[PDB]
Design a binder for this molecule. Structure first.
Ligand SMILES: Nc1nc2c(ncn2[C@@H]2O[C@@H]3COP(=O)(O)O[C@H]4[C@@H](O)[C@H](n5cnc6c(=O)[nH]c(N)nc65)O[C@@H]4COP(=O)(O)O[C@H]3[C@H]2O)c(=O)[nH]1
Ligand SMILES: Nc1nc2c(ncn2[C@@H]2O[C@@H]3COP(=O)(O)O[C@H]4[C@@H](O)[C@H](n5cnc6c(=O)[nH]c(N)nc65)O[C@@H]4COP(=O)(O)O[C@H]3[C@H]2O)c(=O)[nH]1
Ligand SMILES: C[C@H]1O[C@H](O[C@H]2[C@H](O)[C@@H](O)[C@H](O)O[C@@H]2CO)[C@H](O)[C@@H](O)[C@@H]1N[C@H]1C[C@H](CO)[C@@H](O)[C@H](O)[C@H]1O
Ligand SMILES: C[C@H]1O[C@H](O[C@H]2[C@H](O)[C@@H](O)[C@H](O)O[C@@H]2CO)[C@H](O)[C@@H](O)[C@@H]1N[C@H]1C[C@H](CO)[C@@H](O)[C@H](O)[C@H]1O
Lengths: 696, 696
């Protein structure tokens, strides 16, 4: 038999050489039973009797990795009390390091009769449920140098595990769309060729194909609907789901870490794949409903702060413990370099309000494992006071959703005051400066997985989510986009070259900006999604990354060479805001004709032209060793006008500035040199074009 | 000036091989300078310029360990807002891994002019102040097996580092009263001889003798008045103060851990040694006052839920981080095994009420370093809603204040504490069963550092603290004690035996009571504080532990034999609660002195001071380390707190053996006894105990 009492910590199934020590949390269970599934669907149940601080535990020697296991909570069923415990269902371990199988959708996985939401389901769950697996924690990272690339050298590349590699004509068939293929040399090379220093992996926690999707012809692609917070996703693993998916991810990191490539993965802690009531009872519903999920004034129904069914209680210690244990386990055992938190406002909702003194923030700021890895937050959620951009604690880094909306409104041509675009270029002073932050707190991005891609952003006015199954009712409605004259694809040479160069504008404005640049995957080649902007369920050629074999490889070498500029020239990645008001003047703003803009020229309604001077000799920032940082002085000239404009170079005839970037050109100016301008001489600059000059 | 920007983590002086990095937090400091002290007192200031998330820092190559340093925080001095920043006072390092020197009490360590509280003082504090020192973290714990003694084997021995060894006629005079003398073989041999598994260490966090106390002829001895949250008290060091005292501690833990004795130390996190205003500016008054201390509804004045000057803000993320970074520093760097939190209800006061969902409770519960060590609490503060015995989370253990009073009462004679004393032997079923805890969650104790020692407990009716300088106003006013005929020293052998046998009565009940016991240092030799019940300032023979050279060595072998009787028989240290009756095995049954099971009427019969308890050694419904069953001889405990003799009956056919008797003056847990029939009547003296041991 061999049922030893074991230990209470750590939570989950841990392989201590000769056996495995199990420990799960439930304060609302009279009895808890542990099931040991075999390869034929037989359950060898064991009662974890030894409770300690509402966590029941036991050590069962002989149990080893590959053991399919799960729990069955004997507890009250009373939605009136908030409890939905059911022994009939096979509950997943929240602390499971690897989950096997898919959810086979049926009336059994749900925990309530399909006609009576307050009755109780007595159907066995195991033959249709996912199944948590014990994992051997061993891995020999030889020299896993965490390439601790600082914020002022970081190029974040948002990408998917599957879409990035799925259609790659260099990975053998098996590896396309897996973690293993993500480690391939032709992808790491591409990533190292493109200049990225951080890789953002769209949700990699094990997530569930939604029932509403499976019974609609679709699947869950993005993966922002998760149940296994410690489990690499089994469907992204070509090495098996019997606890061998973690072996890929670890090896996927080590291969990536060898090339000086960081891994910052996208975490979704705000909600769970169990949805609201009327959803499935899979992992945490049956264990402890009241202290895992945020229930409403009527405990039957669920408080939502994400619009997606449920939301976790951020003040119950066993929920905070699960997230800190989740983060760290991905830091120190998966060697993940950082996290992009999803809708991170919900994580700071202690009772109702968004608190920046909330216990979650208190925890993260102090723990020596998480507080040092790159902490990125999506600074909003769909509750009251949901817009919190510029209110997270000064440790954090935020998605500048105001950079997206301000830049997409500049190149679109709207009367977005230049003084609204000029602080987004300076790196969002108005949002972060008083908070005690630096420009690197702003993660700038012209496009991400949400909204249009880059090609869709310069080709479509309104969304095209008909094929999502919701009558075009999902995604952002107006995306500050402009089709460039005709919506959809078109053979018009004028519309084509305009779109191909509007894209150039977006990537050029992004790199010359201050803070952290971010690229959505595919925009290097011009990835299209056919007007679809919220492709959470488009798991097909719509969201795959097509790979190039001329125009798509004109924009490619353009973008790479634009990254070289930001890298090579530290003026574009400064550690602290310019001031330059009274004395060296580290920034200056002149009009096209060549005079310093005035308070009246600045925010006058219809003005769409700028010249920006960036003083490379006024970087009062020490390097790593107190080394004073130098760089050539640059002259960025923006023309958001519909017309051809005449820009004067405002220094003197004394000196010479060489043009190094010019959006207008069809061959690509960031990868191709050009003429050097006199210094008082007039330079005609095409409509919706950009230009940069360089001088030491 | 080789000054590199350095890192912002961790806070404090860390030695990176080539040099040392300093990082300090202040969110209301415009300019922070790093003063580096020399041996002729001259300073060498350098700006910690690099402000990152309100943590200013720098790294200085070549700066070796032993360097005396400190921060001077230029900022606002305005007590109407709560700011007492003073760039004249040499602020300590809240993360000082060793603090040298002592406070020379003068008008210069005080930050304000003595006659005017809210004015400004520009007196240099440098020489009159302690100094935070850089420490080299190396120490070779070759094979330092943390003796992770279980919870149901612990015997806590609360000791002070100085009194334990200042008067031991075996250490060299160098080592009397220091950390090294605490780990001499003659001491660890005694703790081994006594059977303890834990050494509760009265505060070693480096503290300051109060100005209040030093202009009186006295000196703070206990040390519950702390500034150094990372340093060992330099006045306990025989090896030096320039960072060398940290070695004393690390090597004093190495020795105790080799002989298998754990380290539990007394932490004081609720309050600081700067007290309220009118007091010094040493570490946190001048660093960032409003974010460190819990301020009033008038920022000039300090909230005080402790009565010791001030209280700490348990909601500012950077005070909880200072606690945690301290907590994890004594386990991960100095190999401590647990902490006793003092006034631990103040730690949970997040705003006003004692919140068991306070961030602090959610921080300890989660952290892998601190949730695993022994978490012992003193569950009360003097503030409103202070007494919270039985209300801490289930992860926590408490000093059972309702045990101490109710056993002090019983042997004192009060006609109430029988049904109450019963549960206190049961393990305080009232206070802990429903909370989800075990009998072990209650630290039982009759006497501690507070109140009377055990000899004073039976030799005084009221306090005698005139020597403390507050005219007998401090401490407990009634401590639930009895003088046994005469208060003070007598020679009547009738009283003296009653005292020496009363001392046997508590220790007997303490080692036979369910849960975790605690021994105050010196109650083996019958230590006497001369009636001083609150001796926090008596750093003299009053609290010095007197080592014995006839009666003193009789009670000694009494206690040691009782702590064994706990060890060798697990019933007195059970791991679950009793249930008494299989409604449809009987593991406990209470009998009358007459010899019949009691009745709910006869239980709460007011006039009753006699008892017979049965314990079933064969009905321990608990597993063992390897699923085994626990087996034991069954015991029969006979309490007579009556003023006279009462004939006690054994419940007929079998035999029983008498193992414990308080009455006979040779001491009879080390002295073998007769065999009692099983129906026979037995005479039990007034205020005495008896235990029977037929094997089951
Ligand atoms: N010695 C010293 N000089 C100080 C200090 N604070 C400001 N200065 C000087 O005064 C300017 C104003 O700084 P700010 O208004 O806080 O506005 C600051 C702040 O927004 C940001 N910044 C610069 N360095 C840091 C830093 O290390 N950490 C953070 N968090 N922000 C920084 O850049 C702004 C100004 O950059 P600068 O070109 O440095 O211009 C700074 C610098 O000239 C200080 O505490 N000590
Ligand atoms: N920390 C901790 N404390 C424990 C544990 N088990 C018992 N205790 C405490 O000790 C009491 C004695 O339990 P019992 O003698 O087994 O008498 C128990 C036992 O026979 C049964 N029982 C209670 N819980 C369980 C359980 O989870 N499994 C099984 N099989 N029986 C249980 O019902 C009785 C009443 O249980 P309680 O009301 O809780 O009464 C329990 C509870 O107060 C434990 O695993 N951990
Ligand atoms: C999975 C989700 O991905 C996206 O949202 C993420 C977001 O990408 C991410 O940044 C965060 O987190 C967000 C929410 O988790 C989509 O926009 C959502 O539509 C999608 N799911 C919703 C689809 C449907 C829309 O009508 C809605 O009624 C349904 O109840 C819900 O399941
Ligand atoms: C230094 C403190 O040591 C002790 O406190 C500890 C206790 O040891 C510990 O076991 C618990 O926790 C307690 C609080 O930490 C004493 O009990 C306190 O009396 C003492 N200080 C106060 C004594 C004095 C009495 O009027 C009062 O006027 C003065 O303002 C104040 O400084």
């Amino acid at each position: 038999m061999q049922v030893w009492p074991g230990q209470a910590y750590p939570l989950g199934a841990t392989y201590d050489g000769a056996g495995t020590n199990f420990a799960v949390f439930s304060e609302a269970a009279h009895r808890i039973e542990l099931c040991l599934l075999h390869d034929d669907g037989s359950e060898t149940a064991v009662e974890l009797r030894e409770t300690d601080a509402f966590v029941r535990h036991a050590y069962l020697p002989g149990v080893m990795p590959g053991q399919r296991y799960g729990f069955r909570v004997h507890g009250p069923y009373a939605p009136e009390r908030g409890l939905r415990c059911n022994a009939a269902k096979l509950l997943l371990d929240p602390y499971a390091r690897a989950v096997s199988g898919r959810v086979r959708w049926g009336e059994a996985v749900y925990g309530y009769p399909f006609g009576r939401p307050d009755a109780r389901n007595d159907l066995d769950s195991a033959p249709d449920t996912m199944t948590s697996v014990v994992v051997n924690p061993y891995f020999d990272w030889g020299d896993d140098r965490r390439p601790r690339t600082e914020y002022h050298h970081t190029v974040i590349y948002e990408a998917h595990v599957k879409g990035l590699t799925m259609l790659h004509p260099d990975l053998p068939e098996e590896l396309r769309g897996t973690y293993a293929g993500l480690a391939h040399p032709s992808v790491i090379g591409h990533l190292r060729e493109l200049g990225v220093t951080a890789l953002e992996l769209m949700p990699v926690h094990q997530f569930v194909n939604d029932h509403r999707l499976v019974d609609a012809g679709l699947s869950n692609y993005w993966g922002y609907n998760t149940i296994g917070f410690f489990a690499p996703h089994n469907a992204y693993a070509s090495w098996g789901d019997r606890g061998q998916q973690v072996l890929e991810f670890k090896s996927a990191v080590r291969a990536l870490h060898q090339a000086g490539i960081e891994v910052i993965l996208d975490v979704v802690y705000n909600h769970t794949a169990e949805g609201n009531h009327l959803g499935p009872t899979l992992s945490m519903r049956g264990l402890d409903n009241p202290s895992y999920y945020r229930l409403a004034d009527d405990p039957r129904y669920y408080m939502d702060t994400t619009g997606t069914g449920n939301s976790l209680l951020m003040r119950s210690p066993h929920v905070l413990q699960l997230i800190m244990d989740s983060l760290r386990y991905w830091v120190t055992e998966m060697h993940v370099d950082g996290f992009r938190f999803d809708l991170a406002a919900t994580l700071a909702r202690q009772f109702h309000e968004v608190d920046r003194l909330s216990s979650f923030f208190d925890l993260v700021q102090q723990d020596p494992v998480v507080s040092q890895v790159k902490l990125i937050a999506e600074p909003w959620d769909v509750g009251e006071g949901g817009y919190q951009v510029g209110n997270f604690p000064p440790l954090w880094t935020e998605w500048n959703g105001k950079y997206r909306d301000c830049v997409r409104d500049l190149w679109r041509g709207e009367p977005r005051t230049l003084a609204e675009f000029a602080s987004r270029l300076t790196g969002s002073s108005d949002l972060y400066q008083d908070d005690g932050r630096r420009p690197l707190a702003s993660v700038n991005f012209v496009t991400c997985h949400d909204g249009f891609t880059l090609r869709d952003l310069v080709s479509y006015n309104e969304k095209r989510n008909e094929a999502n199954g919701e009558g075009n009712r999902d995604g952002e409605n107006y995306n500050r986009s402009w089709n460039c004259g005709e919506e959809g694809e078109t053979e018009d040479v004028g519309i084509t070259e305009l779109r191909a160069r509007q894209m150039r504008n977006f990537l050029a404005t992004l790199m010359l900006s201050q803070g952290v640049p971010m690229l959505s995957h595919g925009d290097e080649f011009g990835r299209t999604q056919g007007g679809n902007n919220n492709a959470y369920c488009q798991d097909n050629e719509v969201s795959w990354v097509r790979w190039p074999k001329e125009a798509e490889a004109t924009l490619l070498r353009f973008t790479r060479s634009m990254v070289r500029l930001r890298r090579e020239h530290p003026v574009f990645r400064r550690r602290r805001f310019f001031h330059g008001r009274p004395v060296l003047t580290d920034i200056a703003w002149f009009t096209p004709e060549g005079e310093e803009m005035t308070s009246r020229d600045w925010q006058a309604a219809h003005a769409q032209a700028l010249t920006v001077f960036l003083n490379g000799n006024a970087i009062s920032e020490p390097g790593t060793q107190g080394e004073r940082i130098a760089d050539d002085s640059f002259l960025l000239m923006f023309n958001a006008s519909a017309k051809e404009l005449e820009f004067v170079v405002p220094d003197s005839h004394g000196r010479y500035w060489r043009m190094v970037v010019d959006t207008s050109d069809p061959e690509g100016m960031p990868p191709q040199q050009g003429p050097e301008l006199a210094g008082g001489e007039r330079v005609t600059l095409a409509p919706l074009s950009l230009t940069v000059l360089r001088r030491p």
